[PDB]
Amino acid sequence: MDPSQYASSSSWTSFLKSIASFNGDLSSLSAPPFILSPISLTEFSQYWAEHPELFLEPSFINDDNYKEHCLIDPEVESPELARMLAVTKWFISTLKSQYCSRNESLGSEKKPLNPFLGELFVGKWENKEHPEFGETVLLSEQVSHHPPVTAFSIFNDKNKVKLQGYNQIKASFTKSLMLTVKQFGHTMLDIKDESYLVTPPPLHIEGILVASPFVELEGKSYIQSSTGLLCVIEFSGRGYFSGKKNSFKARIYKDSKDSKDKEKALYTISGQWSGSSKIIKANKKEESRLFYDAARIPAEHLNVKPLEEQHPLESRKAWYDVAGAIKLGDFNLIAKTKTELEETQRELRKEEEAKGISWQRRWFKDFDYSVTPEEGALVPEKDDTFLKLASALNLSTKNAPSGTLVGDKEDRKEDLSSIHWRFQRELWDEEKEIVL
Ligand SMILES: CC(C)[C@@H](C)/C=C/[C@@H](C)[C@H]1CC[C@H]2C3=CC=C4C[C@@H](O)CC[C@]4(C)[C@H]3CC[C@]12C
Ligand SMILES: [Pb+2]
Ligand SMILES: [Pb+2]
């Protein structure tokens, strides 16, 4: 049907009613075909680097050229600061990809496919027009199905720029039908020997009543560097304090201590992450410059091998029949194809449970950061990057919502685990079946 008839359709009304009794698992909602997306959540990991040049820019900044790599401030105080500005710009550039991609390609936000345990998604940005960039690889794996957890790593060996992280969400509906989403997990970006810890922000999906869902960010995201520098990004929008759609304000501080006082901000960036934003140095509100304009820089999609060459575990290959059914909008075919794949998975889980066998993750392992870790789990190294950056930020290392600080209510939750998924490069190095 036409989108204009979605909201009043029998299908949408039945969907809204299933919300009333939402059991906590999104996969239980009777989402009609027209609100379904043929894309699996394992693919969302690619949204961390759809602007190859911004992802790599920090690695080209050094003690001998940093002032030449800071468009908004040729008088930037240091290379460390120039790089934090670049990482901040890169982070902001990921937002449109992360949260607007479906509105553009599908017409609105839609329900993504719930990945099966073990699902893989791999590809690469060849960066053919920039030989100095080199190839950038994306590895994404569904390390958990119950609950859904996606782990990933994006790396550029030529320039020593590597990223790794994992993501999980916990969602619930408000009485007004707003879908509240708390993200869990974090992402670390290493630029040569310099590291950055990034925490995703909470968000909500509105437009549910009118059958035209869309994402709006809220809360805060942090970018803590080993240099001590810290960027605090606050999100707002319509219905909130600023009243300006997809807005944000980011402040960069010398360190987490300074972040307690907005007056100490070295730079203040403000605008819309899905559009343009300006930056101001210190208190010089007079002199402001364009920081980023999402509309001027097209996203660059990674190269994914053709379906015919994909391994059974690769997302698109495995979901092929279901994606096709969704594109056709065939009620029965969608249910049939989805059940076939999911029932097969269900049977695998039952065999494993009765046989005493467990699914082995391919390129990621779950490290236990608790003071009293599970006896068989891998544990972090004394010089662990996350530990030192979390300590500098005073960020909780528990499985609390992303961005939770030590002491917050979420960090004081009793018997809360501290398990984090980590990329194991050697596992990809000795990978014998999957190729790019
Ligand atoms: C009809 C409703 C139920 C549909 C539209 C909503 C589906 C939810 C589950 C979808 C819509 C937007 C999706 C979404 C968008 C962007 C990101 C950023 C990515 O880095 C992690 C996954 C995450 C956080 C996912 C999680 C699942 C979300 C929140
Ligand atoms: Pb709103
Ligand atoms: Pb384990």
Curated annotation (Swiss-Prot):
Question: Do you know which InterPro entries this protein is assigned to?
Answer: OSBP_sf (IPR037239), Oxysterol-bd (IPR000648), Oxysterol-bd_CS (IPR018494)
Q: Which annotated residues bind cholesterol?
A: 98
* Gene Ontology CC terms, in alphabetical order: cytoplasm; cytosol; Golgi membrane; membrane
- Phosphoserine modification sites are 391
Any idea which GO molecular function terms this record carries? lipid binding; oxysterol binding; phosphatidic acid binding; phosphatidylinositol-4,5-bisphosphate binding; phosphatidylinositol-4-phosphate binding; sterol transfer activity
The keyword Phosphoprotein appears for this protein: yes
The record's Pfam families line, in alphabetical order, gives:
Oxysterol_BP (PF01237)
Chain residues that bind ergosterol: 98
Q: What is the effect of changing residue 99 to F?
A: Abolishes both cholesterol binding and biological function
The record's family statement is: Belongs to the OSBP family.
Present the record's domain note. The OSBP-related domain (ORD) mediates binding of sterols and phospholipids. It displays an incomplete beta-barrel containing a central hydrophobic tunnel that can accommodate a single lipid molecule with a flexible lid covering the tunnel entrance. The ORD can bind two membranes simultaneously. It has at least two membrane-binding surfaces; one near the mouth of the lipid-binding pocket and a distal site that can bind a second membrane.
Q: What else is known?
A: Present with 32200 molecules/cell in log phase SD medium.
The function of this protein is: Lipid transport protein (LTP) involved in non-vesicular transfer of lipids between membranes. Functions in phosphoinositide-coupled directional transport of various lipids by carrying the lipid molecule in a hydrophobic pocket and transferring it between membranes through the cytosol. Involved in maintenance of intracellular sterol distribution and homeostasis. Involved in lipid countertransport between the Golgi complex and membranes of the endoplasmic reticulum.
Task: Write the protein's name.
Answer: Oxysterol-binding protein homolog 4
Per the UniProt record, the source organism is Saccharomyces cerevisiae (strain ATCC 204508 / S288c)
Recall the taxonomic lineage recorded for the source organism.
Answer: Eukaryota, Fungi, Dikarya, Ascomycota, Saccharomycotina
> Quick one: which gene encodes this?
KES1
